């Protein structure tokens, strides 16, 4: 069931669009969101569709998995995987406060391109 935390409809019923969609259900508490509503992307939506995703309230560092220094955690808005900027492989300073694509998507990126 669940519903988008923006319209509170469902993954087959948009409350603000009157049409079906597919929310993002957290694998910790169980709250959902419309990808289009979260400003998500296809890789993120797709990613989060098949795996955990975990709402931001239950977030964590795929790297650590403690969400401790979330002040550094990087929310790859391309699957949701969170990494403390200083946890990544090619660490960053702050910049990915929104975009970012983590290593999963990236290596998938480098592979995607041609």
């Amino acid at each position: 069931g669940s519903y988008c935390d923006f319209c509170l409809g469902g993954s087959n019923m948009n409350k603000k669009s009157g049409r079906p969609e597919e929310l993002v259900s957290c694998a910790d508490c169980g709250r959902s969101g419309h990808p289009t509503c979260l400003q998500f992307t296809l890789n993120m939506t797709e990613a989060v569709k098949t795996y955990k995703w975990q709402c931001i309230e239950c977030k964590s560092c795929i790297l650590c998995g403690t969400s401790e220094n979330d002040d550094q955690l990087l929310f790859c808005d391309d699957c949701d995987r969170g990494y403390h900027m200083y946890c990544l492989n090619p660490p960053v300073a702050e910049p990915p406060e929104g975009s970012w694509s983590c290593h999963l998507c990236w290596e998938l990126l480098k592979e995607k391109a041609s």
């Binding site: 923006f6 509503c37 979260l38 400003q39 709402c55 931001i56 309230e57 977030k59 969400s67 979330d70 955690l73 929310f75 808005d77 949701d80 969170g82 406060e97 929104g98």
Partner: peptide
């Protein structure tokens, strides 16, 4: 650079 925020996104800002 602005704090308008088209939606909210993750990041969790105190609950």
């Amino acid at each position: 650079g602005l704090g308008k925020g088209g939606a909210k996104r993750h990041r969790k800002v105190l609950r």
